[PDB]
Write a protein that binds this DNA or RNA. Structure first.
Lengths: 109, 148, 138, 199, 150
RNA sequence: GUGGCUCGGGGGGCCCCGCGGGACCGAAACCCCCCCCGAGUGUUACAGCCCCCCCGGCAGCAGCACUCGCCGAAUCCCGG
RNA sequence: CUAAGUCAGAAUCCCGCCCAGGCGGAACGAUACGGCAGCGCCGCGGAGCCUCGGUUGGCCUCGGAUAGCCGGUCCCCCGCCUGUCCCCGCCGGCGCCGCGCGCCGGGACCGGGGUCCGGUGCGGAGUGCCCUUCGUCCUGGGAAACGGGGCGCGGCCGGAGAGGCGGCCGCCCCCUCGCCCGUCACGCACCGGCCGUUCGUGGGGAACCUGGCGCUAAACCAUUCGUAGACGACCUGCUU
């Protein structure tokens, strides 16, 4: 099987121009390139997956190196199709261009 | 640089160049390279090198070193130099160098008489010099209470 | 060089706006950009709409200068634009993108197998056509 | 994957303003044939607007003066550096994703190359306004390889045509192969155009 | 509650279980608001199984159903991991390698076989269908879950 | 409609006999045809294009999923 | 003399010669027992730290926009390996060939520019795109039997712009299964409804362990010279 999660790209924080409000990210989902086609994605639990040095447990399996920071997608942004996301623990500002999975499974169909 | 081909016999004058101690070292240089011209298999590889240089290389130069067993210096270290070849099509330019390989080149074959030639070489050295001897700036008057 | 003109009686295709996907007939020209158009049988109203929104079509109706809808409908359906348009190679491209956008998931699976078998067939039958073409070159 | 932008017929600024966003978003963009990048305005005007940049150097120093990179690869890669931050550390870890070449090097030779219609000249310039090729502008102000690249391109354009001559000849076989085996792919090609393909 | 697009005998895509993306055949909703889900063993190796409303994508491909019999028994502490987890006797001596066991049933076995008896002939009615259930759902380049309709 | 003109298009001399008693059963034009067809001029000007205006007199679908241009909610609520 | 297009034009401006050679690449030479070894190339294990991204691929015409594309062409000349293959041509073993040639030339050429028409063109020979399909097992149909596989062998290429490899072929062994439809059977595939690498991974770096092919030094210091020099640096000499 292939990926069951849509791709997305972390692209920064919600920022005025200098007061960078560091608790509401700005995703750019790959494919959605205009608002009003972004009403499908909003509300679906997203995740930021990265590795590390020390091992951590894995629900369902044996410990490995992977760690994830869960989240959610709140509401639409702009007109090009970006979406704000409220992460359970603000993202570490290291991943400003790296992958952020948008799972499908909180569903509305 | 595209490819390089070295002659089978290298004068032991030239081998001096690639080293820093002729008293210390075992002088094993280009020894494993003298073989490709000795067995047949290398020749099949080597002639391919020249053929490739015909098709691709635009400008060809030749590595010519000087004699030293004739000059009355203290030196026994030949000077290697690239010399360009200017002439007809590349193939005949290369067939010229593969012919001249390993041979002597007199001055007459290069130059003429009453030609204009250009002399390039590192100037003499006078060492760390002040500004009056360097740039020929004016000397101040004699009465200056510091360097004049 | 130009081979499709805008004149009184043309039939334009609307691409941008609320009326996209419907043919419309040009009645009269008001300026560079807007054109007073109408579609009697394409369920469209008599209203100006900009020249940016229309893709021209080869067909021509017959109008005097400007008329009611009673006489646009007659010359429209005496030439059968509603059927002549559906017989063009153009329309079949629009309905192709309008079926591909309707593909239900199990349907898409049918194509995955179908396009899978149909491509092995060509792959072999090209090789048999590949051998002969080289063979006859010699 | 990896974009390979073809820079023939594009405008300088409008193409850079698009690559600058992509690079900051993390995608590895590589541009080819910058020496065909057009620019708005005259030619005599823009040569003045580059000979007005060669002057802006506190001359006998490179410290107290800027760097006047001349090769069209560097001219475009410089006018992107303006549009990114580069004093940060995401500024310099982004800029080194963009890779800019003159002509087309062999690694990107056999790669489909994507235009960017938002910046294309035939779209963003009126039919009568004038324009300035980056090649002639750069070769005038001291580029030393207007000829060396030009001969190599002649070598490639012919070597591409040989491939395309091959590519065209194939598709005829596949086009003809359908007519040979149409008798026994009947029930497949039916279901492909029910679903909207092949019409 | 149920969404407006889920009816008995519809095909789903399951999104968060052990098997993340099989197709299945939904039967009915239990008293506890979780979908009864079975992609019959002989097509997916998925038994009678509960699944949540929210974790399941509904697809526009249904089969008529009349095998809705056999009321529920499902629970846990029935297949729960009783080799590693707390419940083996609700006791706290050394475990997790001492006794390895997962409870396995016989009534579920006949129950599963007596359900797809009514179902499997209805599945075979549409051609190529059992192929569709065997394969697994997975996104691919050019698949945009906002632009494709199920 | 007619009117003088300019531009292109259909072609237009002919059979028959198993190379022969003579010509590609072929259009061939240096060019010719119309009461032939498709367009630009100015013309008076019909109702076999219309448009507007004036007498008298038809249910037509309502601020419209024919998405031409308003303001609103004791004339206002339902579902997510 | 300008609006489109075009010409002549200078101590200016830009480059060349001339001076330095970038946390810039090159090509080539050599690579440490006279050892109890250190090692480089091909074969294949088992652990022990780490650095991070990713989660089918797309192997390519040129080029215009007041136009382009695809085809078949009897028609036409040619950029073609002196424009290639047969051959009249002098002579020998002149119906045949070249132990020598020149293709004057008829004729054969996969191509491409040209001709002509025939198709599409809000481009289906479509990046609104194309290709690959990621649950295991009987037999019984369909394309298939010029099919597949084995870091296979031997040659050809083809590539230099940062080929750093890809492709084509001749031969070797066995299979007739691998794709699309069917029937039948499956380890209830463990989570009982529920989270994190599903993959490009044989990813990169480094330290310790398995064979064969094979390798045997250079730099610096001390010394010397003065073609160099404030000390460094530099140019040089030292068992035939």
């Amino acid at each position: 099987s292939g990926r069951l999660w849509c791709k997305a790209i972390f692209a920064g924080y919600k920022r005025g121009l200098r007061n960078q409000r560091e608790h509401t990210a700005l995703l750019k989902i790959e494919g959605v390139y205009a608002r009003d086609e972004t009403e499908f994605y909003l509300g679906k639990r997203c995740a930021y997956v990265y590795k590390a040095k020390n091992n951590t447990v894995t629900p369902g399996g044996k410990p490995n190196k992977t760690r994830v920071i869960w989240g959610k997608v709140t509401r639409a942004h702009g007109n090009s199709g970006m979406v704000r996301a409220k992460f359970r623990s603000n993202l570490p500002a290291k991943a400003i261009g790296h992958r952020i999975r948008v799972m499908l499974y909180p569903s509305r169909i | 640089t595209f490819k390089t081909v070295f002659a089978e016999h290298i004068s032991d004058e030239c081998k001096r160049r690639f080293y820093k101690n002729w008293h210390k070292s075992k002088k094993k240089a280009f020894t494993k390279y003298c073989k490709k011209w000795q067995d047949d298999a290398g020749k099949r590889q080597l002639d391919k090198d020249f053929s490739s240089m015909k098709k691709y290389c635009q400008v060809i130069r030749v590595l010519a070193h000087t004699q030293m067993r004739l000059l009355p210096l203290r030196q026994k270290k030949a000077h290697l130099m690239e010399i360009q070849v200017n002439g007809g099509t590349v193939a005949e330019k290369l067939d010229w160098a593969r012919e001249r390989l390993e041979q002597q080149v007199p001055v007459s074959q290069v130059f003429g008489q009453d030609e204009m030639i250009d002399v390039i070489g590192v100037t003499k050295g006078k060492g760390y010099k002040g500004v009056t001897s360097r740039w020929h700036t004016k000397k101040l008057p004699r009465k200056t209470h510091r360097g004049l | 060089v130009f081979r499709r003109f805008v004149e009184v009686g043309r039939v334009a295709y609307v691409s941008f706006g609320p009326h996209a996907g419907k043919l419309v007939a040009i009645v009269d020209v008001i300026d560079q950009n807007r054109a007073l158009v109408d579609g009697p049988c394409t369920r469209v109203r008599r209203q100006a709409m900009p020249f940016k929104c229309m893709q021209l079509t080869d067909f021509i109706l017959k109008f005097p200068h400007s008329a009611r809808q009673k006489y646009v409908r007659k010359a429209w359906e005496k030439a059968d634009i509603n059927t002549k348009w559906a017989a063009t190679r153009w329309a079949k491209k629009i309905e192709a993108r309008e079926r591909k956008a309707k593909m239900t998931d199990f349907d898409r699976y049918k194509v995955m197998k179908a396009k899978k078998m149909r491509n092995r067939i060509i792959k072999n039958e090209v090789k048999k056509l590949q051998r002969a073409a080289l063979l006859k070159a010699s | 994957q990896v974009l390979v932008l073809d820079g023939r017929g594009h405008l300088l600024g409008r193409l850079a303003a698009i690559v600058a966003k992509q690079v900051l978003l993390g995608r590895k963009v590589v541009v080819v044939r910058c020496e065909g990048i057009n620019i708005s305005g005259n030619f005599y005007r823009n040569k003045l607007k580059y000979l007005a940049f060669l002057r802006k150097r506190m001359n006998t120093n490179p410290s107290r003066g800027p760097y006047h990179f001349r090769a069209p690869s560097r001219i475009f890669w410089r006018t992107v550096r303006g549009m990114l931050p580069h004093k940060t550390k995401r500024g310099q870890a982004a800029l080194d994703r963009l890779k800019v070449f003159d002509g087309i090097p062999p690694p990107y030779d056999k790669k489909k190359r994507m235009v960017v219609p938002a910046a294309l000249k035939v779209v963003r310039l009126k039919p009568t306004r004038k324009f300035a090729y980056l090649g002639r502008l750069a070769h005038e102000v001291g580029w030393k390889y207007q000829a060396v690249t030009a001969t190599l391109e002649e070598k490639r354009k012919e070597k591409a045509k040989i491939h395309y001559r091959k590519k065209k000849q194939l598709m005829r076989l596949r086009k003809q192969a359908e007519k040979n085996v149409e008798k026994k792919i009947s029930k497949f090609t039916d279901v492909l155009k029910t679903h909207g393909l092949l019409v | 509650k149920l969404r407006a697009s889920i009816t008995p005998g519809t095909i789903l895509i399951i999104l968060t279980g052990r098997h993340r993306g099989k197709r299945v055949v939904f039967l009915k909703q239990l008293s506890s608001g979780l979908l009864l889900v079975t992609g019959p063993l002989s097509l997916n190796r998925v038994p009678l199984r509960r699944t949540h409303q929210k974790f399941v994508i509904a697809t526009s491909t249904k089969i008529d159903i009349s095998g809705v019999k056999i009321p529920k028994h499902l629970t846990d502490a029935y297949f729960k991991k009783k080799k590693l987890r707390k419940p083996r006797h609700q006791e706290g001596e050394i475990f997790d390698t001492e006794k390895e066991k997962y409870e396995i049933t016989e009534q579920r076995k006949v129950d599963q076989k007596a359900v797809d008896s009514q179902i499997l002939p209805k599945i075979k009615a549409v051609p190529q269908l059992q192929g569709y259930l065997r394969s697994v759902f997975a996104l691919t380049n050019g698949v945009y879950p906002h632009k494709l309709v199920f």
